[PDB]
């Protein structure tokens, strides 16, 4: 009755063309108004194989972002190695709005309501949808932040496990916020962490993660090398390009108090969106502040495991299209 | 695609060695480099990866502490540099890159090869 | 881990060697062949496929954790060492040398 397919998508979101942030302002161009009355129809009788390591739509997703972070986040200046191009360094203010992708006439999509369905499969309870649950596109790095949540208990994701080279994409079942804050009156920050709540649910992450390695012990450690986007939390904040030190983070002999992390906002980054370096204009004045919920986390597996204690996890930048699979995992474009 | 390899060095225990590798004919931040050695009565062995857009790495984790590796994507280079050496890490070490199509393992792709050796 | 056998392997032009290689980890299994001086060239992935430039007297079989790398119509340019591959691990190797 129907077959996998590629097609072109629209995006829908509840952007106003009175609100000027960057996000909104793009969306009112770019999107459609979101479905007053949204109409899922699930059937029985039916199964499906979903492959979100292979989802088409990570793609789109991603190309919008792009997209997105060519008018908004313009630099002052671009490295691009061959070429060094000055232009209008626009103060940058944006929030994520979730935006909702939807198919065209003739498509589809596929929503997998398996309460645990880990990724890659068959699956069992599947509904049919016209649009995605609202996402908002937060590039980040290690952490997941403002993405949605487990229904039942902590899921691991992989391509293949075993493969060092796989991404692992953890998924929380309760978020933990992180507050992020700048003081006034330059370049320094800090962020704040539950200690307790953060902890809890890493002993439920690490027993969940050895439940899949035949209860062998499992360690953490920071990043073993890279540039600054990956071996701290980087992530944009009101304009602002934070990069917070997660060593501290990863603490073995805890396994309390509210831990603090060290954190700097940098003016020369390194573009995600592509490549060269990127140079934007100081960072304005004024106490700056952003409170996110981790609900998800990125780590690769160190190799050469030999002795079977000891797998060594490193929190993972990876590849951005991971940010937009950890939310788009569950869907699937389909042919009529 | 070419893979060239720096030439082969000659270093006292305890130095340290920096060994290049230089890719083309293909998109160079587009793949994962690893890198591969094979000492004299010793099976080949993998050192550890590192993906080129990120400079992120993985590294074997008997390398743990020793080996870096970084890229010049400038000059489409990746390096490797194995640090405090010891006699048994006289070898060939290599780079190579997955197979064209990607799995990424299947070693369709090696550099000539940098012999070093390590001796008092 | 990768046992690769056997060891060594001592044969006349012509004939057909047989390499075997247990894994105790399932996954895609690869055969390469390095000559004296030369970087390893890939010759078989997936357990059971040839890669390019790579010639029919070259076959590779496999069975649950053994694997089987078979070299027919031996030539000159086959002598070698071979290594079985899974993920980042290989065997230690099997030296195949000529013996007229």
């Known amino acids: 009755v129907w077959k996998d397919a590629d097609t072109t998508l629209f995006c829908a979101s509840d952007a106003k063309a009175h609100e000027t942030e960057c996000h909104n302002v793009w969306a009112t161009h770019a999107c459609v108004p979101t479905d007053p009355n949204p109409q899922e129809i699930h059937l029985e009788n039916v199964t499906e194989n979903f492959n979100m390591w292979k989802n088409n739509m990570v793609e789109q997703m991603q190309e919008d972002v792009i997209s997105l972070w060519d008018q908004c986040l313009q630099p002052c200046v671009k490295l691009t190695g061959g070429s060094v191009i000055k232009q209008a360094c626009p103060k940058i203010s944006f929030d994520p709005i979730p935006i909702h992708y939807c198919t065209p006439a003739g498509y589809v999509i596929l929503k997998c309501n398996d309460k645990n369905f880990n990724g890659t499969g068959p699956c069992k309870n599947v509904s049919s949808v016209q649009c995605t649950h609202g996402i908002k596109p937060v590039v980040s790095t290690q952490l997941l932040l403002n993405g949605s949540l487990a229904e039942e208990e902590i899921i691991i994701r992989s391509e293949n496990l075993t493969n060092n080279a796989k991404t692992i994409i953890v998924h929380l079942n309760k978020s933990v916020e992180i507050n992020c804050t700048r003081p006034s009156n330059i370049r320094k920050a800090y962020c704040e962490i539950n200690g307790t709540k953060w902890n809890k649910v890493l002993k439920q992450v690490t027993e969940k993660l050895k439940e899949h390695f035949n209860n062998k012990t499992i360690i953490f450690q920071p990043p073993s090398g890279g540039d600054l986007e990956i071996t701290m939390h980087h992530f944009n904040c009101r304009g602002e390009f934070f990069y917070c030190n997660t060593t501290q983070l990863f603490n073995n002999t805890c396994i309390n108090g509210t831990i603090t992390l060290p954190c700097k906002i940098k003016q020369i980054i390194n573009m995600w969106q592509g490549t060269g370096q990127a140079m934007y204009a100081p960072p304005i004045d004024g106490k700056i502040n952003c409170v996110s919920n981790i609900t998800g986390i990125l780590l690769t597996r160190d190799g050469g495991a030999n002795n079977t204690s000891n797998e060594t996890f490193r929190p993972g930048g990876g590849n951005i299209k991971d940010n937009w699979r950890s939310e788009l995992y569950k869907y699937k474009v389909v042919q009529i | 695609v070419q893979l060239v390899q720096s030439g082969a060095e000659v270093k006292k225990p305890g130095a340290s060695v920096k060994v290049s590798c230089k890719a083309s004919?293909?998109?160079?931040?587009?793949?994962?480099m690893h890198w591969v050695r094979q000492a004299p009565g010793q099976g080949l062995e993998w050192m550890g990866w590192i993906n080129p857009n990120s400079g992120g790495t993985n590294y074997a984790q008997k390398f743990q502490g020793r080996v870096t590796m970084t890229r010049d994507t400038s000059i489409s280079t990746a390096y490797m540099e194995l640090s405090r050496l010891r006699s048994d890490d006289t070898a060939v070490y290599y780079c190579?890159?997955?197979?064209?199509?990607?799995?990424?393992?299947?070693?369709?792709?090696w550099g000539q090869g940098t012999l070093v050796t390590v001796s008092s | 881990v990768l046992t690769q056998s056997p060891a060594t392997l001592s044969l006349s032009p012509g004939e057909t060697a047989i390499i075997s290689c247990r894994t105790s980890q399932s996954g895609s299994l690869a055969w390469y062949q390095q000559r004296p001086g030369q970087a390893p060239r890939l010759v078989i992935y997936?357990?059971?496929t040839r890669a390019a430039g790579i010639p029919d007297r070259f076959s590779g079989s496999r069975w649950g954790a053994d694997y089987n790398l078979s070299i027919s119509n031996l030539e000159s340019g086959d002598f070698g060492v071979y290594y079985c591959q899974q993920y980042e691990f290989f065997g230690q190797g099997t030296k195949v040398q000529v013996d007229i």
């Open positions: 190579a890159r997955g197979k064209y199509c990607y799995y990424n393992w299947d070693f369709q792709h």
């Open positions: 004919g293909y998109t160079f931040t587009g793949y994962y």
């Open positions: 997936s357990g059971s």
